[PDB]
């Protein structure tokens, strides 16, 4: 059979709500269900249907006439359960999974995974939100009836715990290590005991006393002399710079055309990109050609690589080989083993030509200055 597991458990008051009243359990099954039990934990009083597995629970009021059940689930939402409603129908999303849930008499705080608290109303309308400096590990309730102080706590991950009322911070403490669980009650014989457990173990018990301009640069004589020369001889500068720009365009076009002629550009309709890396000292170097098809979606079927070296200095096993089908977007490393043959250190260039199989003009090329041999 397919049973379930219980994850969250709190109590709910029957009719009196004093120190001697009878309380009834409320279980949150792993199956998305809430079981409102009996005073003696043997029979079911109610079965409530929830849309997601609850993680945190809050029970306010008296069960018979006025019960409010807030359920923080795993889907990052608070669902409230009232009388006659088998389904909540009043849900509030937090945007992040709720790490805690503590119910103040009027406001309901929800601790977010985004390191903050969000105070909502029991009708489904947020009224405030406060930001934490670090993560929220555990939220509990600090209630002292002498001063009527019922404030939510916060066990932050930055090695501190800050007690929070409606909006104000107070009584922030420090710990030698970030704290994972806090409890405030009448432990021992003090109405104001707070016991706290470190993320690494250990215990810290605290008893609350009842007596609570810019970098704008500078300019020197050189700058004013240069600006004076520019103001007195601006025309000649303009003319000679335009002449120099014309000559530069001329020479750049010349070199671009010469490169196109020799096809020496490792980057050059017909999309490709290749560059050759050399690795290793010693007589044997690993020469890996990183080749890449740079197109939207079009493979390149017939291509082939041919090496040009000095056959007296380098012994290439396979100086010519086909390349795989180049899929657009993947860098193919195609490696070879160059080997220096000269007994004396001689560094000679090696050319690489990538070309079609039906054409004789290289599609593109690359050069590599082979380093020294460091032989034997």
């Amino acid at each position: 059979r397919r049973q379930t597991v219980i994850t969250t458990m709190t109590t709910l008051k029957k009719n009196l709500a004093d120190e001697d009243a009878v309380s009834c359990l409320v279980l949150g099954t792993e199956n998305k269900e809430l079981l409102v039990l009996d005073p003696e934990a043997f029979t079911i009083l109610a079965k409530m249907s929830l849309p997601s597995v609850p993680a945190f629970l809050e029970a306010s009021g008296q069960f018979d006439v006025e019960f409010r059940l807030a359920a923080a689930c795993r889907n990052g939402s608070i669902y409230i359960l009232r009388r006659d409603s088998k389904r909540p129908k009043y849900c509030i999303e937090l945007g992040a999974q709720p790490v805690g849930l503590v119910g103040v008499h009027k406001v309901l705080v929800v601790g977010s995974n985004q390191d903050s608290l969000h105070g909502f109303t029991y009708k489904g309308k947020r009224l405030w939100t406060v930001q934490m400096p670090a993560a929220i590990l555990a939220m509990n309730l600090l209630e002292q009836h002498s001063r009527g102080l019922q404030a939510v706590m916060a066990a932050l991950a930055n090695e501190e715990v800050r007690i929070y009322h409606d909006k104000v911070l107070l009584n922030v403490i420090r710990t030698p290590e970030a704290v994972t669980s806090l409890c405030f009650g009448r432990y021992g014989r003090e109405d104001n005991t707070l016991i706290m457990t470190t993320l690494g173990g250990g215990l810290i018990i605290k008893i609350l006393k009842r007596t609570a301009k810019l970098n704008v640069p500078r300019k020197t004589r050189l700058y004013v002399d240069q600006t004076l020369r520019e103001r007195e001889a601006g025309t000649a500068m303009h003319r000679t710079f335009q002449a120099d720009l014309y000559l530069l365009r001329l020479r750049a076009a010349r070199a671009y055309v010469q490169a196109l002629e020799s096809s020496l550009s490792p980057v050059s309709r017909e999309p490709l990109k290749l560059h050759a890396v050399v690795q290793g000292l010693g007589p044997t170097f690993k020469l890996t050609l990183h080749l890449q098809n740079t197109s939207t979606a079009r493979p390149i079927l017939g291509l082939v690589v041919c090496f040009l070296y000095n056959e007296v200095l380098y012994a290439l096993p396979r100086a010519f080989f086909k390349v795989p089908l180049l899929v657009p977007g993947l860098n193919y490393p195609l490696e070879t083993f160059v080997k220096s043959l000269s007994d004396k250190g001689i560094s000679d260039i090696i050319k690489v030509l990538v070309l079609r199989e039906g054409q004789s003009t290289p599609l593109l090329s690359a050069h590599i200055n082979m380093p020294m041999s460091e032989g034997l």
């Binding site: 004396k344 250190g345 001689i346 560094s347």
Partner: protein, 52 residues
């Protein structure tokens, strides 16, 4: 004798938009004298090896 009037107000950015940055101009570092001598002595051996 009329002087052309220039606008007194420039163009001001009203939002910071992430633009691809370029690498920065590279001042070629100079060399020492020992380094030049070492490189020339390294290449002279190559030249004599090729010239034999």
């Amino acid at each position: 004798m009329f002087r052309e009037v220039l606008p007194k107000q420039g163009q001001l950015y009203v939002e910071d938009i992430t633009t691809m940055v370029l690498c920065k101009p590279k001042l070629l570092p100079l060399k020492s004298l020992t380094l030049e001598k070492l490189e020339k002595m390294q290449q002279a051996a190559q030249d004599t090896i090729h010239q034999q």
